[PDB]
């Protein structure tokens, strides 16, 4: 979860390569988008939409085994002193689509990298960030310009605990290599079910191989398929996205003179072509 | 006054210049796309002006390169204009030039009397792309530093020379300060002179031989 | 009206030129005033305007500073480079693609030798070009788009 | 890094020109000649 | 992020035409 | 989109105005 990102990787969610640490545990890949407009003006509330699509009507494996809906997380990282819009200022239908979300900052001070989630899958198909542009006229190391924004979003539960052990939403190899002896089925007054399998004859050969509850097995009886294998099948309907995107923090002034300089041009251009015409005419008095 | 035109006219025969200009005509199969050329050129002059403007702030040194680009953006007056224009106009030149390749080819402007022109055109083409690859990595940031890293490896595939070529290219065995050094000399002193000698032929021929004919 | 001048086909000199592949700038709208003086500046000024405009509404990024230990995933070259880089990367032969690059230039030179077998300009009159051109112009674009994509929904361009 | 705006800029004009290019070759290859080659 | 490109394509292409027509049209309004 | 489309129409429109207009003014005080 977004929090254990923070928890495990304190000063940043992204490495120098652009990865985003999240992808260390969430092993699946599924697409993530991130729209925001092409330009904002300074001091402005504006929307940024995170997208995290997954096929709504299907289910993943849970802790113990059940077979439950699922949840989107996501860290987004806005450019320098962008921050979530202060709330008197979000206006209205926006309040509404933002919903009930928690925009938590990746470390004290960095308001511009926000963790978000675990939200529940079905209303958080798309996730809105109401955000507000800095103002380079008043914060004196914010300049106008074009800047990057990076999302990495994930949806559905992951493959490794922040503690270092495997979850059950992956798929177990087979330790050594030989002929299997026993598909037991544990369920001790707690920590539920437990398919207990093991291999043999060859050389040494009695190694034991438990495998949590909620994968399948699709490897049955007899057998010996080699060095850590098939046995499980793939529980994991989950997984992780990434997106980068540009945004220009524009200054209306630049826009204003630009527009002026253009008309100044268009005008000149017609004015020449006008001249030319007036010459095509003094010329017609020079063939005859 | 005390006639100025004359003064020159006496000495230099300034006339011939005009009589030479004004005595040239434009055939009617010469339609809009026969601007592609001059546009690609226009683009390039814009390069040369904005480019040289940046040589007053850019540091081609591995500590200061990247920082300095930021100064340009950021703190020099119109830094962003200047640099951004450099950036867009690179692209417009690589493109308008592809567009002009198309009009030449589907006009067979490259045909007999003119095969030299087409040949020079292609060299211009290669020099422009190099203007391109080199410029791109002077900011000595993440994307540009890997481009030098890849494209300098490429030469090395070639068997006898090829390593040796790569070392000239990058100034040692591995991309480093010599590289930004050499890349700068390249983008700002070699390429421009090369590009001019060869636009010089490309225009000289064209002037001598007049535009291809009609379809 | 326009403004005009008819080839004067009685002129030995012009004739001898038309002859050679070229008296072509001798007949037509006069190029002083007419086309330099008046419309030039239009083309130049427009060209400038667009580029300024572009530059103002969508300026230059500055990206991260260079890290000798990181390759950034998502590294492309510039665009006009895609096509080649496409090739370069669907060609397990190192040495090969490099030749294959080089050919774009070499080949491109070869053209007016080859295509000199005859002599028409207009491509309508010259089927066999207009094809291998259309052909290649197309592969080029398609190889182009090719890196806008991921490794291997790459050539299939993700539809087969 | 990919650059959208430009990429449309490109195909846009590329096609548009390939377009008009063949379209004049035609206009021209059908009105033929004029003034005597 | 891929419909910035679309628009651009789209109008790079379309707009040509418009300018075209528009000048042609001028052209009429004055008579070649 | 809808907004450009308008501003756009008006903007060309308007220049197209000046264009045509100023031919004529320019025609009939006989300069062209």
């Amino acid at each position: 979860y977004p929090f254990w990102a923070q928890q495990t990787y304190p000063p940043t969610p992204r490495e120098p390569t652009g990865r985003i640490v999240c992808a260390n545990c969430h092993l699946a890949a599924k697409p993530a988008e991130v729209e925001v407009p092409q330009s904002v003006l300074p001091d402005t509330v504006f929307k940024a939409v995170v997208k995290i699509p997954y096929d709504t009507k299907l289910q993943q494996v849970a802790a113990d085994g059940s077979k439950v809906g699922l949840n989107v997380g996501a860290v987004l990282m806005l450019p320098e002193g962008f921050k979530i819009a202060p709330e008197e200022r979000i206006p209205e239908e926006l309040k509404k689509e933002v919903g009930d979300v928690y925009f938590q900052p990746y470390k004290e001070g960095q308001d511009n990298v926000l963790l978000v989630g675990p939200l529940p899958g079905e209303q958080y198909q798309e996730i809105v960030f109401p955000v507000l542009s800095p103002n380079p006229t008043t914060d004196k190391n914010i300049h106008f310009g074009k800047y990057a924004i990076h999302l990495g979003a994930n949806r559905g539960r992951g493959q490794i605990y922040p503690t270092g052990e495997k979850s059950n939403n992956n798929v177990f190899t087979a330790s050594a290599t030989g002929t299997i002896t026993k598909i037991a089925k544990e369920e001790d007054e707690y920590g539920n079910v437990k398919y207990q399998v093991s291999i043999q004859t060859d050389s040494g050969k009695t190694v034991v191989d438990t495998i949590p509850a909620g994968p399948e097995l699709i490897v049955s009886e007899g057998q010996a398929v080699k060095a850590g294998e098939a046995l499980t099948n793939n529980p994991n309907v989950g997984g992780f996205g990434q997106d980068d995107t540009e945004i220009v923090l524009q200054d209306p002034n630049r826009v204003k003179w630009m527009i002026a300089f253009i008309c100044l041009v268009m005008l000149a251009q017609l004015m020449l072509i006008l001249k030319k015409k007036q010459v095509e005419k003094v010329q017609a008095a020079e063939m005859n | 006054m005390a006639n100025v035109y004359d003064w020159f006219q006496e000495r230099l025969e300034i006339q011939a210049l005009a009589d030479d200009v004004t005595s040239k005509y434009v055939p009617p199969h010469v339609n809009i796309f026969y601007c592609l050329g001059g546009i690609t050129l226009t683009c390039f002059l814009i390069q040369f002006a904005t480019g040289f403007a940046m040589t007053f702030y850019y540091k081609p040194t591995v500590t200061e390169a990247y920082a300095s680009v930021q100064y340009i953006m950021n703190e020099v007056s119109f830094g962003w204009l200047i640099r951004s224009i450099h950036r867009w106009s690179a692209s417009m030149m690589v493109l308008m030039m592809i567009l002009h390749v198309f009009r030449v080819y589907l006009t067979g402007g490259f045909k007999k009397p003119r095969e030299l022109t087409w040949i020079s055109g292609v060299i211009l083409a290669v020099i422009t792309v190099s203007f391109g690859v080199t410029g791109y990595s002077l900011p000595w940031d993440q994307v540009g530093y890997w481009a030098v890293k890849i494209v300098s490896g490429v030469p090395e595939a070639i068997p006898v020379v090829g390593v040796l070529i790569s070392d000239l290219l990058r100034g040692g065995s591995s991309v480093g300060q010599a590289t930004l050094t050499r890349y700068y000399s390249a983008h700002t002193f070699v390429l421009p002179w090369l590009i001019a000698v060869f636009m010089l032929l490309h225009f000289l021929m064209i002037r001598k031989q007049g535009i291809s004919g009609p379809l | 009206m326009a403004t005009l001048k008819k080839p004067d086909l009685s002129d030995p000199k012009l004739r001898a030129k038309l002859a050679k592949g070229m008296g072509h700038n001798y007949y037509g709208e006069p190029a002083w005033p007419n086309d330099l003086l008046y419309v030039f500046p239009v083309v130049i000024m427009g060209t400038f305007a667009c580029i300024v405009a572009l530059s103002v509404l969508d300026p230059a990024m500055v990206g991260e500073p260079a890290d000798p230990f990181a390759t950034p995933l998502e590294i492309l070259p510039e665009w006009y480079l895609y096509p080649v880089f496409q090739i370069l990367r669907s060609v397990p032969n190192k040495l090969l693609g490099v030749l294959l690059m080089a050919s774009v230039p070499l080949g491109l030179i070869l053209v007016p030798f080859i295509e000199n077998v005859n002599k028409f300009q207009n491509p309508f009159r010259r089927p066999v070009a207009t094809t291998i051109f259309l052909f290649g112009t197309l592969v080029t674009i398609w190889l182009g788009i090719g890196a806008t994509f991921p490794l291997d929904k790459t050539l299939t361009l993700g539809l087969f | 890094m990919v650059e959208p705006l430009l990429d449309g800029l490109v195909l846009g004009l590329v096609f548009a020109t390939l377009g008009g290019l063949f379209y004049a070759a035609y206009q021209q290859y059908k009105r033929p000649n004029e003034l005597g080659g | 992020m891929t419909e910035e490109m679309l628009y651009a394509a789209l109008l790079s292409f379309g707009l040509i035409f418009v300018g075209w027509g528009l000048g042609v049209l001028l052209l009429k309004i004055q008579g070649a | 989109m809808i907004l450009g489309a308008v501003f756009y129409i008006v903007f060309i429109a308007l220049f197209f105005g000046i264009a045509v207009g100023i031919i004529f003014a320019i025609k009939s005080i006989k300069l062209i």
Binding site: I273 | - | V43 | - | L11, G23, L27 | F15
Partner: peptide, 29 residues
């Protein structure tokens, strides 16, 4: 928050007018 839009239109309009002007200007193709 759409001088921003007037913004781009201004580009579109030169692109247009420029072609426009060139064709008008040379009975254009």
């Amino acid at each position: 928050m759409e001088i921003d839009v007037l913004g781009w239109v201004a580009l579109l309009v030169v692109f247009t007018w420029s072609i426009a002007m060139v064709v008008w200007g040379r009975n254009g193709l």
